[PDB]
Nucleic acid binder design. Structure first.
Ligand SMILES: [Cl-]
Ligand SMILES: [Cl-]
Ligand SMILES: [Mg+2]
Ligand SMILES: [Mg+2]
Ligand SMILES: [Mg+2]
Ligand SMILES: [Mg+2]
Ligand SMILES: [Mg+2]
Ligand SMILES: [Mg+2]
Ligand SMILES: [Mg+2]
Ligand SMILES: [Mg+2]
Ligand SMILES: [Mg+2]
Ligand code: NA
Ligand code: NA
Ligand code: NA
Ligand code: NA
Ligand code: NA
Ligand code: NA
Lengths: 140, 156, 186, 95, 154
RNA sequence: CCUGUCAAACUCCAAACUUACAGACGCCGUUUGACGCGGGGAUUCCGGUGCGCGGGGUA
RNA sequence: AGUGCAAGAGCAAAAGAUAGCUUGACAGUGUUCUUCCCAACGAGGAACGCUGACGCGAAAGCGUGGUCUAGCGAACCAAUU
RNA sequence: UUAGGCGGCCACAGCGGUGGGGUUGCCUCCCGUACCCAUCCCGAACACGGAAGAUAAGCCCACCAGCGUUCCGGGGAGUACUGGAGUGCGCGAGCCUCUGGGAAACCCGGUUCGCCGCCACC
């Protein structure tokens, strides 16, 4: 049963929602791989009327690239609880989000016969706190 | 203007406010009277039943209603009874007020279409039918002949 | 699901198995389809025709029943695909089938992909199929050379037990060679 | 009519019931008919092409050759003989 | 098998109704025809229902009327037993009548005009403004009902 | 939750009925030639009324 | 939701969005429907072909302008190819 | 069909939920980036290579009706409406009779947790 039920980290998105950049550079060094532009939708008063327009960057890290990052990110954060997803995710911080899930996720991300993960097989906020807390730190 | 001009249901239903503007407000003050805080938990339930399909202008509705409820003050301002007028004047009515040229009239009012045998009024009373009288006065101000019908009340 | 007005997709669309827009374009040819499908371990190839109550498969080949002819290697690779294509193609010819259009379902038209390998095989079997030569692998990779060289970077057998240690694109030739004459079920 | 375009008064006949909404099954768009076959004409709201003039919705004509992939169906409008160019998507075999 | 008698004129009657009567071989008031009880025929009589009198007659009545008002496809010739015998498959009127009722044959098949041109009802009929259920003479009738009419128009 | 009402330009529904084609019966046509084709000659393009369904209008 | 603009209709691995590439908004010539139900009538419109040349795509295929129904103009004369 | 591929009809198949199943035909999740190929950033996906592990997802199998849907019984209802007819009624609006058709809502009880086709396969 277990082993295929135990949580794991799937991508950590570090993004700097600026409002118009030079910021990529630091993201590249803080993570280790190229950042991606962040176009915006809708015209608005914050002199942000341009639809297609660089307004921030993000970086999706997977595997070691994600751990080796969290092994310094987490330490720089305190928070826990309430600040957790209903799916067992959490964002802290410049933002750093951690997407958590169990072994059979590809089933909902592939092209052929894809399918939505059953609620039971989903990750709960609690089942998440445990996994992470059980990895160099404390909850709440 | 006379009811003669609008009491018949010979014209198409004309109620789409999305295509009609300038509709006069309704003169009907209320639809729930008496103790509306309480629910129909009364022994007796009399109803005013229209005996012919007709169109009743909000004018007549208000006069009819007032004449009945204003009288139901034989029981008092805060008496124990609840009065309900179940119809609403949805049908918009016009008047061609040039002669027969470009005669589509302009909105002048609203009326409620009632089919013979429907109940336009329903009162709820304890064995104290002063309501039967309130209605003799109500069907007095609406076009059709009417039937005063009692439902829960084998207390004759 | 939600109400009377709700619109439920066609079953094969729910199952995310059939692309009906591509299907229609495929059926336009009026020719049989060369259905190229893959599995983590195997590769299938069918020649399907249209029917009153659903499709009709007139000839097929599965990477598993490849061993039935002397295959002693894994079945989820390039050489595997090609051969399965050729095997299905041959059976196809036997069935009186002369032409078909490649249907790769929900797979991607990536150059040198296995579905194209399957297509190359079917074509060599004799099947006339609309294709484009430079979207196919360069023969050597079809032979399985890319894997042999990969095992050159050995230190540990690429194949757990299986057959050989340095693998064999030669085993590939022996097989293709075999398929091109006589033998049962062809 | 307040206008005289082809789609005048076709609100009903060219609309799908909410559940038949969406791309139609390809099986019937590829159906093959033979000259002489009787076919019912009915536009499929979901299929844009290969249509015919809405006035003919309901007719049952006789397939008599084809043009491109479209078929040439012979019908009789009132008392007049007409030829309609239509695709299988909007045809059905009679009986 | 039902006996059909037109009791109302053509003036002002729907054309599709008048054409039906004509398809049933009746082209005048008081003319009568015998019609099999089939789905096809049933629909036709239903459409003519308000301008006619119909119902299943008795063996006797049919015989009386056949003898009195039957005619050859052409000519004056009286259709009596001898005629019936020397011209039809049957040996006498009764034999023909029975065959008609049992819907085994038809007036044409036996070289007879499909129409029994009756006489106005002696004593008059019950009126052509109401159906039987209302005291009138229109619509489906009783076998006893039809017989009276047919006999009065003998 | 409970409770009071509506739609010519609303519809989860839904007739009677109208309508394409085909078969069957009926009727009709093969000396009264139907169905149809080609040609000659028109008149006619102020209409009205009843009933059913209407739209406008106090009528 | 969006799909340039009335209204109604169509569309979700798309007819919408993003990106890239491209010029089929191509020449010639037709079939058919519409304009004008039935039922004759022009310009105009549309559907569906073919011949030629192309674009994209692995390919089936799609592209006869814009998802569909409005956005149009005779003879004479002039200019233009 | 002890798990597969392509489909037809396109909710009777949807939504939600329970139980069961794999040294192997198998499908998956899974493991992994030298290659073909790939991410406006990530072998996530796509693509390729492969079996250390698992049946927890998916999937297949058995089942549940609470919601949605399909069809049926009984009731609503031969009601509403309606094609044909009337020197029937009514000041009229309108109604009635005969004849041929005939509903919707809703309630109660059943049904429905897909059916079928081709191919492959201890
Ligand atoms: Cl596949
Ligand atoms: Cl057309
Ligand atoms: Mg309409
Ligand atoms: Mg004679
Ligand atoms: Mg006398
Ligand atoms: Mg009389
Ligand atoms: Mg009509
Ligand atoms: Mg177009
Ligand atoms: Mg001039
Ligand atoms: Mg010029
Ligand atoms: Mg399980
Ligand atoms: Na004027
Ligand atoms: Na009165
Ligand atoms: Na559809
Ligand atoms: Na034209
Ligand atoms: Na960019
Ligand atoms: Na499983």
């Amino acid at each position: 049963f277990h082993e295929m039920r135990e949580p794991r980290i799937e991508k950590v998105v570090v993004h700097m929602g600026i409002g118009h950049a030079n910021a990529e550079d630091i993201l590249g060094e803080i993570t280790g791989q190229m950042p991606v532009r962040t176009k915006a939708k809708r015209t608005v008063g914050e002199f942000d009327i341009r639809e297609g327009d660089p307004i921030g960057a993000k970086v999706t890290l997977r595997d070691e690239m994600a751990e080796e990052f969290l092994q310094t990110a987490l330490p720089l954060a305190e928070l826990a609880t309430s600040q957790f997803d209903d799916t067992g995710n959490f964002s802290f911080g410049l933002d750093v989000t951690v997407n958590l899930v169990r072994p059979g996720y590809r089933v909902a991300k592939r092209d052929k016969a894809s399918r939505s993960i059953p609620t039971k097989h989903r990750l709960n906020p609690a089942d998440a706190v445990a996994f992470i807390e059980s990895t160099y730190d404390v909850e709440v | 203007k006379p009811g003669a001009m609008y009491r018949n249901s010979s014209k198409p239903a004309y109620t789409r406010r999305e295509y009609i503007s300038g509709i006069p407000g309704k003169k009907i003050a209320q639809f729930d009277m008496g103790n509306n805080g309480a629910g129909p938990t009364y022994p007796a339930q009399v109803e005013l039943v229209v005996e012919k399909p007709v169109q009743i202008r909000h004018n007549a509705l208000e006069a009819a209603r007032v004449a009945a409820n204003r009288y139901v003050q034989n029981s008092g301002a805060a008496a124990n009874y609840k009065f309900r007028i179940r119809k609403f004047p949805f049908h918009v009515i016009r008047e061609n007020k040039d002669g027969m040229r470009a005669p589509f009239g302009k909105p002048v009012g609203t009326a409620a279409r009632v089919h013979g045998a429907n109940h336009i009024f329903i009162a709820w009373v304890n064995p104290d039918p002063n309501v039967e009288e309130a209605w003799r006065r109500a069907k007095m101000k609406v076009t059709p002949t009417i039937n005063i019908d009692s439902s829960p009340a084998g207390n004759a | 699901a939600t109400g009377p007005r709700y619109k439920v997709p066609m079953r094969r669309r729910r199952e995310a198995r059939t692309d009906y827009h591509q299907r229609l374009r495929l059926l336009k040819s009026g020719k049989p389809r060369l259905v190229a499908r893959k599995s983590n371990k195997h590769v299938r190839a069918q020649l399907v025709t249209l029917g009153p109550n659903g499709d009709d498969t007139l000839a097929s080949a599965h990477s598993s029943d490849l061993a039935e002819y002397g295959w002693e290697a894994p079945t989820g690779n390039m050489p595997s695909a090609y051969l399965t294509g050729l095997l299905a193609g041959l059976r196809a010819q036997e069935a009186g089938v002369e032409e078909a259009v490649l249907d790769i379902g929900l797979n991607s038209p990536t150059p040198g992909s296995k579905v194209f390998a399957i297509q190359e095989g079917a074509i060599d079997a004799g099947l006339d199929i609309p294709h484009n030569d430079d979207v196919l692998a360069d023969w050597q990779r079809t032979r399985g050379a890319h894997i042999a060289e990969y095992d050159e970077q050995l230190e540990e057998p690429l194949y757990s037990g299986d057959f050989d240690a340095a693998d064999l694109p030669e085993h590939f030739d022996e097989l293709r060679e075999t398929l091109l004459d006589g033998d049962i079920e062809l | 009519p307040s206008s005289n375009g082809p789609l005048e008064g076709t609100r009903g006949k060219l609309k799908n019931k909410p559940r038949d909404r969406g791309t139609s099954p390809p099986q019937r768009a590829v159906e093959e008919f033979d000259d002489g076959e009787k076919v019912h004409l009915k536009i499929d709201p979901s299929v844009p092409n290969g249509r015919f003039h809405p006035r003919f919705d309901g007719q049952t004509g006789t397939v008599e050759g084809k043009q491109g992939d479209a078929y040439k169906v012979d019908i009789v409008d009132g008392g007049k003989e007409k030829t309609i160019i239509v695709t299988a998507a909007h045809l059905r075999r009679q009986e | 098998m039902h006996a059909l008698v037109q009791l109302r004129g053509e003036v002002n009657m729907h054309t599709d109704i008048q054409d039906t009567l004509e398809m049933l071989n009746i082209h005048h008031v008081n003319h009568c025809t015998l019609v099999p009880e089939t789905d096809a025929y049933r629909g036709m009589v239903a459409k003519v229902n308000d301008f006619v009198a119909f119902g299943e007659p008795s063996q006797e009545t049919l015989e009386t009327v056949l003898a009195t008002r039957a005619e050859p496809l052409e000519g004056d010739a009286d259709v009596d037993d001898e005629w019936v015998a020397e011209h039809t498959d049957y040996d006498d009127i009764s034999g023909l009548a029975f065959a008609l009722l049992s819907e085994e044959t038809t007036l044409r098949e036996q070289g007879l005009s499909p129409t029994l041109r009756l006489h106005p009802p002696r004593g008059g009929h019950d009126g052509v403004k109401h159906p039987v259920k209302e005291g009138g003479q229109l619509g489906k009738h009783d076998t006893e009902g039809i017989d009276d009419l047919l006999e009065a128009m003998r």
